[PDB]
UniProtKB/Swiss-Prot annotation, chain C:
This is dCTP deaminase, dUMP-forming. The chain holds residues 1 to 161 of 190 of the full protein. It is an enzyme of class 3 (hydrolase). It comes from Mycobacterium tuberculosis (strain ATCC 25618 / H37Rv). The keyword Heme does not apply. dTTP inhibits both the combined reaction and the dUTPase reaction. Its EC number is 3.5.4.30.
Amino acid sequence: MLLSDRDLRAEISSGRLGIDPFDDTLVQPSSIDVRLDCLFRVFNNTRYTHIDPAKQQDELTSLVQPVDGEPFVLHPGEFVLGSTLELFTLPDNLAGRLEGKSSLGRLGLLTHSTAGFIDPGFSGHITLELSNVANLPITLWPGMKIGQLCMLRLTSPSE
Amino acid sequence: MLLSDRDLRAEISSGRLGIDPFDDTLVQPSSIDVRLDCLFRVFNNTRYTHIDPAKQQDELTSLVQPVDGEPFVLHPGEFVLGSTLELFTLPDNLAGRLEGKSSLGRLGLLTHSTAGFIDPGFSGHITLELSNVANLPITLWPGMKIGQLCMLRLTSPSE
Amino acid sequence: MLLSDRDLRAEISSGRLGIDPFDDTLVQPSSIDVRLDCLFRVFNNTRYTHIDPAKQQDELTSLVQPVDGEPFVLHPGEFVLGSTLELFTLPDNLAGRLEGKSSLGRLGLLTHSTAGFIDPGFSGHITLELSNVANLPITLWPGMKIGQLCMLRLTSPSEHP
C-alpha cells in the first residue's frame, strides 16, 4: 500500500521516517524525489578476470569525485555505483522502492538496475546503480534530482 | 495494495479509471494488458556530442513510423521511445506500475527501463522505453500486446 | 500491500502459500530470498536472423547445465534464462514481485529485466532473466541466493486466476 504525500508528511513530521536533509518541495503525489551524491565507485577491470560473488575482491572498485564545477560523464555501457544525497531511516512497518523520474527516463538513464528494494529498518544513504542505455554520453551533476522513493506499508510490523 | 480483476472492472465500469479503447479480454488476474502504438522516437546522435538533462536539446529525437503492415525492427543496443495504444485516465487514489509480460520477457524485450511509475491523476498515452538485451533483433508489430499495467491503491486520496 | 515476515510465515505455515523446498532462514523483513537452479537456456543466434514474437520459434534456445562443482559464467552483454530452485504456489489473493539482492545489485547482476511480476494463482518455478551490465564476467553458482520475492496483498481475491 502506497503512502500518499499527506501520509509521507505525517510519518516524517513524527520522526518515524528519517530523511536528512529534508526538503518539502521534493514530496510528490505518492513518492519523494531523491538527489545525487557526489561520490562514485567505478570498476577496476584491468586487474581481474571476473567477479565471483562467493569471494571477496577488495580492489574491485575505486572511489571517485568530479573536480568542482565538473560533471561525472556516464558513457553507454559503463556501470557505476553512486548514492542518494539524503540519509534515510525507515521504521519497522514501511518498505521503500526506488523509481526513475519520467524526465530522466526518456533520456536513457537507469538509476537502480539490479536493486531498488529497501528493507524496513534500513538506515543509510541509498545505493544507486547507474547505467546509460542511450546512444550518447549523459552528464551527471552532483545534487540533481536523480529519481524518486515510494513508501509501501506492510500488512504488519516486522519481527 | 494491488487491485484484482474484479476491482479493476469495478473502477472501469464506473468511469473512475479511464481506458480507451477498452477490451475486456485484456484484463488479467491482477493487471491489464496494454498494446503497442505505431509512432516511435529514435535518437539523432550524429548532431550531438551528449545529452544534458539541464538543457533543452531540441532535435535529439525524431518521429518514426513504419509502413502499415511493417514491423519496427529493434536491434540489440538501440534505445527507442514508444507508447501504449490505449489512453489512460487515473483518479487521485490509484497509481500505476508497468510490468513486462512473461512471454516477451523471455525474448529479451524491455518496455519501461528507466521509468514505469505512473502518478495518480495521470492522463495520456503511457510512454514506453524500448530496449533489446537479447542477441538478435526483435520485430515489433504495432497493436501487439507489449506489457501490463497494475493498479495500486493509495492509503488515501492525494492533494 | 506488502506482507511482513510474520504474515509470510502465517501464509506458509497454513499452506495457502507454497514454497518447496522451504528454508526459514531465508525469510527477510518483508520478502523471502530465492535461490538459483542449475538449468539455463541460452540463445542460438547463428540459425535465425531475428526474433518474431508473433511466430513460434522452437530451436530458439539451448540447454546449458554447468558441470557439478563448477559455475555458469555470465559475460557482459549475454542474455540467459534461468530458474528459481524453489517451487512456488500462490493463492488467488496474493501477487509476487521479484527484486534484486543489494549485494548482487552492486556487482552488476540483473535477475528479472524484462519480467518480474507473478500473477495470483501462479504455480511453478519462477523464470529468471539473467543479465550482466558490469564490465567483468560474473561466476554464477547454482544454489546461491539470487534474489528476493515480495508478496503483495490484493484488494480482494481474483476472479479469473
